[PDB]
Scaffold this active site. Structure first.
Site, short mmCIF file in Angstrom:
data_model
loop_
_atom_site.label_atom_id
_atom_site.label_comp_id
_atom_site.label_asym_id
_atom_site.label_seq_id
_atom_site.Cartn_x
_atom_site.Cartn_y
_atom_site.Cartn_z
N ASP A 35 -10.07 92.18 126.32
CA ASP A 35 -8.53 92.37 126.31
C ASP A 35 -8.17 92.23 124.81
OD1 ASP A 35 -5.93 92.92 126.79
OD2 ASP A 35 -5.83 91.24 128.26
N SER A 199 3.15 102.11 113.64
CA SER A 199 2.50 103.52 113.48
C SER A 199 3.92 104.37 112.77
CB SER A 199 2.48 104.21 114.80
OG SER A 199 2.22 105.60 114.84
#
Ligand SMILES: CC(=O)N[C@H](CCc1ccccc1)C(=O)O
Ligand code: NA
Length: 330
Positions: A35, A199
Protein backbone atom coordinates in the site's frame (compact mmCIF):
# COMPACT_ATOMS: atom_id res chain seq x y z
CA UNK A 1 20.85 -5.56 -2.81
CA UNK A 2 17.58 -5.92 -4.69
CA UNK A 3 14.30 -7.77 -4.32
CA UNK A 4 11.63 -8.86 -6.83
CA UNK A 5 8.23 -10.31 -5.91
CA UNK A 6 5.15 -11.19 -7.92
CA UNK A 7 1.89 -9.48 -6.95
CA UNK A 8 -1.40 -11.24 -7.74
CA UNK A 9 -4.99 -9.93 -7.93
CA UNK A 10 -7.15 -11.17 -5.06
CA UNK A 11 -10.22 -11.63 -7.31
CA UNK A 12 -11.55 -11.31 -10.86
CA UNK A 13 -12.03 -7.52 -10.51
CA UNK A 14 -8.46 -6.64 -9.39
CA UNK A 15 -9.94 -5.29 -6.19
CA UNK A 16 -6.47 -5.52 -4.56
CA UNK A 17 -3.18 -7.31 -5.08
CA UNK A 18 -1.31 -9.59 -2.68
CA UNK A 19 2.41 -10.19 -2.50
CA UNK A 20 4.03 -12.98 -0.45
CA UNK A 21 6.22 -11.75 2.41
CA UNK A 22 8.49 -13.87 4.64
CA UNK A 23 8.37 -12.90 8.32
CA UNK A 24 10.40 -14.46 11.11
CA UNK A 25 12.72 -17.45 11.54
CA UNK A 26 11.84 -20.01 10.27
CA UNK A 27 9.96 -17.98 7.65
CA UNK A 28 6.22 -17.52 7.99
CA UNK A 29 4.88 -16.48 4.58
CA UNK A 30 1.92 -14.09 4.65
CA UNK A 31 0.22 -12.50 1.64
CA UNK A 32 0.23 -8.75 2.18
CA UNK A 33 -1.41 -5.85 0.38
CA UNK A 34 1.42 -3.48 -0.57
CA UNK A 35 0.00 0.00 0.00
CA UNK A 36 1.81 3.12 -1.24
CA UNK A 37 -0.87 5.15 0.56
CA UNK A 38 -0.01 4.06 4.13
CA UNK A 39 3.07 3.41 6.25
CA UNK A 40 2.30 0.50 8.61
CA UNK A 41 3.31 -3.13 8.08
CA UNK A 42 0.62 -4.96 10.03
CA UNK A 43 -0.47 -8.57 10.03
CA UNK A 44 -3.14 -10.91 11.24
CA UNK A 45 -1.54 -12.75 14.11
CA UNK A 46 -1.86 -15.19 17.01
CA UNK A 47 -2.98 -12.06 18.98
CA UNK A 48 -5.90 -11.20 16.67
CA UNK A 49 -9.34 -11.58 18.35
CA UNK A 50 -10.39 -15.10 17.22
CA UNK A 51 -13.88 -14.02 16.00
CA UNK A 52 -12.15 -11.46 13.67
CA UNK A 53 -10.06 -14.09 11.84
CA UNK A 54 -11.78 -15.97 8.97
CA UNK A 55 -9.33 -17.83 6.76
CA UNK A 56 -6.30 -15.48 6.91
CA UNK A 57 -2.82 -16.85 7.52
CA UNK A 58 -1.52 -15.51 10.84
CA UNK A 59 1.90 -14.48 12.07
CA UNK A 60 2.80 -16.23 15.36
CA UNK A 61 5.71 -14.33 16.95
CA UNK A 62 6.22 -17.01 19.63
CA UNK A 63 7.29 -19.42 16.80
CA UNK A 64 9.94 -16.99 15.43
CA UNK A 65 13.39 -17.17 16.98
CA UNK A 66 14.11 -13.59 15.73
CA UNK A 67 10.87 -11.95 17.00
CA UNK A 68 11.15 -9.46 19.88
CA UNK A 69 8.30 -7.52 21.51
CA UNK A 70 8.80 -3.79 20.95
CA UNK A 71 7.88 -3.09 24.57
CA UNK A 72 5.21 -0.44 25.13
CA UNK A 73 4.57 0.19 21.43
CA UNK A 74 1.01 0.22 20.09
CA UNK A 75 -0.55 1.12 16.79
CA UNK A 76 -3.97 2.05 15.45
CA UNK A 77 -4.87 2.96 11.90
CA UNK A 78 -7.99 4.08 10.01
CA UNK A 79 -8.04 3.95 6.19
CA UNK A 80 -9.90 6.14 3.65
CA UNK A 81 -12.56 3.34 3.16
CA UNK A 82 -13.52 3.40 6.89
CA UNK A 83 -11.64 0.17 7.74
CA UNK A 84 -9.30 -0.02 10.73
CA UNK A 85 -6.98 -2.18 12.75
CA UNK A 86 -4.86 -1.89 15.90
CA UNK A 87 -2.52 -3.83 18.13
CA UNK A 88 0.98 -4.15 19.49
CA UNK A 89 4.41 -4.41 17.81
CA UNK A 90 7.24 -6.89 17.34
CA UNK A 91 10.51 -6.47 15.53
CA UNK A 92 11.48 -9.36 13.25
CA UNK A 93 13.25 -10.23 10.04
CA UNK A 94 11.13 -9.48 6.95
CA UNK A 95 12.00 -10.53 3.40
CA UNK A 96 10.30 -9.50 0.15
CA UNK A 97 11.38 -11.16 -3.06
CA UNK A 98 14.82 -12.03 -1.67
CA UNK A 99 15.46 -8.60 -0.03
CA UNK A 100 15.82 -8.93 3.75
CA UNK A 101 15.42 -6.31 6.48
CA UNK A 102 16.36 -7.14 10.04
CA UNK A 103 14.65 -5.37 12.91
CA UNK A 104 11.53 -4.43 10.88
CA UNK A 105 8.54 -3.33 12.94
CA UNK A 106 5.82 -5.95 12.39
CA UNK A 107 2.57 -4.57 13.81
CA UNK A 108 0.52 -7.46 15.20
CA UNK A 109 -3.24 -6.92 15.02
CA UNK A 110 -5.32 -7.44 18.14
CA UNK A 111 -8.40 -6.01 16.40
CA UNK A 112 -9.40 -5.62 12.77
CA UNK A 113 -12.60 -4.17 11.29
CA UNK A 114 -15.17 -6.27 9.45
CA UNK A 115 -13.85 -5.49 5.94
CA UNK A 116 -10.48 -7.13 6.86
CA UNK A 117 -12.12 -10.16 8.50
CA UNK A 118 -14.36 -10.68 5.45
CA UNK A 119 -11.38 -10.68 3.06
CA UNK A 120 -9.72 -14.08 3.64
CA UNK A 121 -7.11 -13.41 0.89
CA UNK A 122 -5.33 -10.47 2.62
CA UNK A 123 -3.16 -11.37 5.64
CA UNK A 124 -2.17 -7.75 6.33
CA UNK A 125 -0.73 -4.59 4.74
CA UNK A 126 2.79 -3.50 3.93
CA UNK A 127 2.87 0.28 3.82
CA UNK A 128 5.10 2.05 1.29
CA UNK A 129 4.21 5.71 1.87
CA UNK A 130 6.58 7.93 3.86
CA UNK A 131 7.44 6.86 7.42
CA UNK A 132 6.02 10.15 8.79
CA UNK A 133 2.57 8.47 8.47
CA UNK A 134 3.48 5.40 10.55
CA UNK A 135 1.06 5.06 13.47
CA UNK A 136 3.29 3.32 16.06
CA UNK A 137 3.32 5.14 19.42
CA UNK A 138 5.25 6.31 21.32
CA UNK A 139 8.17 5.65 18.94
CA UNK A 140 7.23 5.97 15.25
CA UNK A 141 8.63 3.15 13.09
CA UNK A 142 10.09 3.00 9.59
CA UNK A 143 8.58 1.31 6.55
CA UNK A 144 10.18 -1.74 4.99
CA UNK A 145 11.38 0.48 2.12
CA UNK A 146 12.97 3.07 4.41
CA UNK A 147 14.74 0.33 6.38
CA UNK A 148 15.93 -1.34 3.12
CA UNK A 149 16.92 1.92 1.39
CA UNK A 150 20.60 2.23 2.33
CA UNK A 151 21.21 -1.47 1.32
CA UNK A 152 19.53 -1.15 -2.11
CA UNK A 153 21.48 -0.76 -5.34
CA UNK A 154 19.27 2.31 -6.09
CA UNK A 155 16.83 3.91 -3.58
CA UNK A 156 13.71 2.97 -5.54
CA UNK A 157 10.90 0.52 -5.80
CA UNK A 158 8.66 -0.08 -8.81
CA UNK A 159 5.05 -1.13 -9.16
CA UNK A 160 4.03 -3.06 -12.25
CA UNK A 161 0.43 -4.10 -11.59
CA UNK A 162 -1.37 -6.41 -13.99
CA UNK A 163 -4.83 -6.09 -15.51
CA UNK A 164 -6.56 -9.32 -14.56
CA UNK A 165 -3.08 -10.85 -14.27
CA UNK A 166 -0.07 -10.99 -11.95
CA UNK A 167 2.51 -8.22 -11.89
CA UNK A 168 5.67 -7.32 -10.02
CA UNK A 169 7.08 -5.19 -7.20
CA UNK A 170 10.81 -4.64 -7.53
CA UNK A 171 13.10 -3.04 -4.95
CA UNK A 172 16.44 -1.45 -5.71
CA UNK A 173 16.47 -1.54 -9.51
CA UNK A 174 14.49 -0.51 -12.57
CA UNK A 175 13.75 -3.42 -14.96
CA UNK A 176 14.29 -1.76 -18.36
CA UNK A 177 12.54 -4.76 -20.04
CA UNK A 178 9.27 -4.13 -18.14
CA UNK A 179 8.12 -0.95 -19.98
CA UNK A 180 8.02 0.59 -23.44
CA UNK A 181 9.47 3.93 -24.53
CA UNK A 182 10.95 6.16 -21.84
CA UNK A 183 10.05 6.86 -18.18
CA UNK A 184 8.75 10.38 -17.47
CA UNK A 185 9.65 11.59 -13.97
CA UNK A 186 7.55 14.14 -12.08
CA UNK A 187 7.92 16.04 -8.77
CA UNK A 188 6.64 14.66 -5.44
CA UNK A 189 5.50 16.49 -2.33
CA UNK A 190 6.01 14.57 0.93
CA UNK A 191 4.16 17.27 2.91
CA UNK A 192 1.16 14.96 3.62
CA UNK A 193 3.32 11.78 3.82
CA UNK A 194 2.09 10.44 0.46
CA UNK A 195 3.57 9.97 -2.99
CA UNK A 196 1.78 13.21 -4.04
CA UNK A 197 2.31 14.59 -7.55
CA UNK A 198 0.53 16.80 -10.06
CA UNK A 199 -0.84 15.35 -13.29
CA UNK A 200 -0.78 17.74 -16.25
CA UNK A 201 -4.31 16.91 -17.49
CA UNK A 202 -6.57 14.35 -19.07
CA UNK A 203 -8.45 13.22 -22.14
CA UNK A 204 -11.60 11.11 -22.50
CA UNK A 205 -11.46 8.51 -25.26
CA UNK A 206 -10.23 10.04 -28.54
CA UNK A 207 -11.08 13.57 -27.27
CA UNK A 208 -8.75 16.53 -27.02
CA UNK A 209 -6.35 16.64 -24.08
CA UNK A 210 -7.35 19.15 -21.40
CA UNK A 211 -4.26 20.79 -19.84
CA UNK A 212 -5.07 21.23 -16.14
CA UNK A 213 -3.13 20.55 -12.93
CA UNK A 214 -4.55 17.64 -10.88
CA UNK A 215 -2.80 17.11 -7.52
CA UNK A 216 -3.15 13.54 -6.29
CA UNK A 217 -1.46 10.54 -4.73
CA UNK A 218 -0.11 7.34 -6.25
CA UNK A 219 -1.87 4.73 -4.08
CA UNK A 220 -1.52 1.02 -4.78
CA UNK A 221 -3.82 0.27 -1.87
CA UNK A 222 -6.85 2.04 -3.46
CA UNK A 223 -8.71 0.10 -6.16
CA UNK A 224 -10.21 2.94 -8.20
CA UNK A 225 -9.25 6.29 -9.77
CA UNK A 226 -10.73 9.20 -7.77
CA UNK A 227 -10.62 12.58 -9.58
CA UNK A 228 -12.36 15.92 -9.37
CA UNK A 229 -16.08 15.93 -10.09
CA UNK A 230 -15.64 18.02 -13.25
CA UNK A 231 -13.24 15.45 -14.76
CA UNK A 232 -15.36 12.47 -13.73
CA UNK A 233 -18.58 14.04 -15.10
CA UNK A 234 -16.80 14.68 -18.42
CA UNK A 235 -15.79 11.00 -18.58
CA UNK A 236 -19.17 9.46 -17.76
CA UNK A 237 -21.01 11.91 -20.06
CA UNK A 238 -19.45 9.85 -22.90
CA UNK A 239 -21.19 6.62 -21.74
CA UNK A 240 -24.90 6.36 -22.67
CA UNK A 241 -26.99 5.68 -19.60
CA UNK A 242 -24.21 6.34 -17.05
CA UNK A 243 -25.27 8.19 -13.92
CA UNK A 244 -24.17 8.91 -10.39
CA UNK A 245 -26.20 6.83 -7.87
CA UNK A 246 -26.00 8.08 -4.17
CA UNK A 247 -27.95 4.20 -3.42
CA UNK A 248 -24.76 2.55 -4.81
CA UNK A 249 -22.48 5.51 -3.88
CA UNK A 250 -20.85 6.15 -7.24
CA UNK A 251 -21.18 6.30 -11.00
CA UNK A 252 -22.77 3.23 -12.56
CA UNK A 253 -23.30 2.42 -16.20
CA UNK A 254 -25.15 -0.15 -18.30
CA UNK A 255 -23.26 -3.38 -18.42
CA UNK A 256 -23.96 -3.42 -22.20
CA UNK A 257 -21.75 -0.31 -22.69
CA UNK A 258 -18.32 -0.18 -24.27
CA UNK A 259 -16.29 2.27 -22.11
CA UNK A 260 -13.94 4.89 -23.54
CA UNK A 261 -10.32 5.07 -22.49
CA UNK A 262 -9.07 7.70 -20.08
CA UNK A 263 -5.70 9.43 -20.54
CA UNK A 264 -3.79 11.24 -17.80
CA UNK A 265 -0.76 13.46 -18.23
CA UNK A 266 2.66 13.03 -16.63
CA UNK A 267 4.58 16.09 -17.78
CA UNK A 268 4.40 16.01 -21.62
CA UNK A 269 3.84 12.21 -21.49
CA UNK A 270 0.46 10.49 -21.54
CA UNK A 271 -0.71 7.26 -19.87
CA UNK A 272 -3.76 5.67 -21.45
CA UNK A 273 -6.12 3.61 -19.29
CA UNK A 274 -8.10 1.28 -21.60
CA UNK A 275 -11.86 1.39 -21.21
CA UNK A 276 -11.99 -2.19 -20.03
CA UNK A 277 -9.85 -1.25 -16.97
CA UNK A 278 -12.71 1.09 -15.88
CA UNK A 279 -15.31 -1.75 -15.71
CA UNK A 280 -15.82 -3.07 -12.22
CA UNK A 281 -18.68 -5.40 -13.09
CA UNK A 282 -22.25 -5.76 -11.96
CA UNK A 283 -23.04 -3.86 -8.71
CA UNK A 284 -24.67 -6.92 -7.19
CA UNK A 285 -24.61 -10.46 -8.63
CA UNK A 286 -26.71 -10.71 -11.81
CA UNK A 287 -27.34 -6.93 -12.17
CA UNK A 288 -27.10 -5.11 -15.48
CA UNK A 289 -25.90 -1.96 -13.65
CA UNK A 290 -22.09 -2.04 -13.63
CA UNK A 291 -19.91 -0.04 -11.28
CA UNK A 292 -17.44 2.52 -12.69
CA UNK A 293 -13.73 2.55 -12.09
CA UNK A 294 -13.43 6.34 -12.23
CA UNK A 295 -15.22 8.05 -9.35
CA UNK A 296 -15.40 11.52 -7.83
CA UNK A 297 -12.92 12.50 -5.13
CA UNK A 298 -15.14 15.41 -3.99
CA UNK A 299 -16.15 13.51 -0.73
CA UNK A 300 -12.47 12.42 0.08
CA UNK A 301 -10.35 15.63 0.20
CA UNK A 302 -7.63 14.27 -2.17
CA UNK A 303 -7.42 12.86 -5.67
CA UNK A 304 -6.22 9.25 -5.75
CA UNK A 305 -4.44 7.54 -8.63
CA UNK A 306 -5.34 4.05 -7.45
CA UNK A 307 -4.88 0.71 -9.14
CA UNK A 308 -7.12 1.56 -12.16
CA UNK A 309 -4.57 4.19 -13.13
CA UNK A 310 -1.36 2.60 -11.86
CA UNK A 311 -1.87 -0.75 -13.59
CA UNK A 312 -1.84 1.07 -16.96
CA UNK A 313 1.78 2.09 -16.25
CA UNK A 314 5.18 0.97 -15.02
CA UNK A 315 5.58 3.21 -11.95
CA UNK A 316 8.85 4.18 -10.30
CA UNK A 317 8.74 5.29 -6.64
CA UNK A 318 12.09 7.09 -6.37
CA UNK A 319 13.00 7.54 -2.66
CA UNK A 320 16.17 9.55 -3.13
CA UNK A 321 16.67 12.47 -0.69
CA UNK A 322 14.43 14.45 -3.13
CA UNK A 323 11.76 11.84 -3.99
CA UNK A 324 10.13 11.69 -7.44
CA UNK A 325 7.66 9.42 -9.25
CA UNK A 326 8.19 8.02 -12.75
CA UNK A 327 5.61 6.66 -15.24
CA UNK A 328 6.14 4.63 -18.41
CA UNK A 329 3.69 2.95 -20.71
CA UNK A 330 3.99 -0.85 -20.95
C1 LIG B 1 7.74 18.37 -14.94
C2 LIG B 1 8.11 16.95 -14.78
O1 LIG B 1 7.41 16.04 -15.27
N1 LIG B 1 9.27 16.70 -14.11
C3 LIG B 1 10.05 17.73 -13.41
C4 LIG B 1 11.38 17.14 -12.94
C5 LIG B 1 11.24 16.07 -11.84
C6 LIG B 1 12.61 15.58 -11.40
C7 LIG B 1 13.29 16.12 -10.32
C8 LIG B 1 14.56 15.67 -9.99
C9 LIG B 1 15.15 14.68 -10.74
C10 LIG B 1 14.49 14.13 -11.79
C11 LIG B 1 13.23 14.57 -12.12
C12 LIG B 1 9.28 18.27 -12.19
O2 LIG B 1 8.22 17.70 -11.91
O3 LIG B 1 9.76 19.29 -11.60
NA1 NA C 1 -17.38 -1.87 -4.03
Amino acid sequence: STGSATTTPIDSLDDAYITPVQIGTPAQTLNLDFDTGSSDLWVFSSETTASEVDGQTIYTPSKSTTAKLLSGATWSISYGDGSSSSGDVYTDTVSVGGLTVTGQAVESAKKVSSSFTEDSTIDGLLGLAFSTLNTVSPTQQKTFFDNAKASLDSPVFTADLGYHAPGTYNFGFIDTTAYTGSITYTAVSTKQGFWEWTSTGYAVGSGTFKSTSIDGIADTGTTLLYLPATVVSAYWAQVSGAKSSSSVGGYVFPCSATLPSFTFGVGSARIVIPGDYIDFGPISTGSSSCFGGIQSSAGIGINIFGDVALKAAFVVFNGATTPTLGFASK
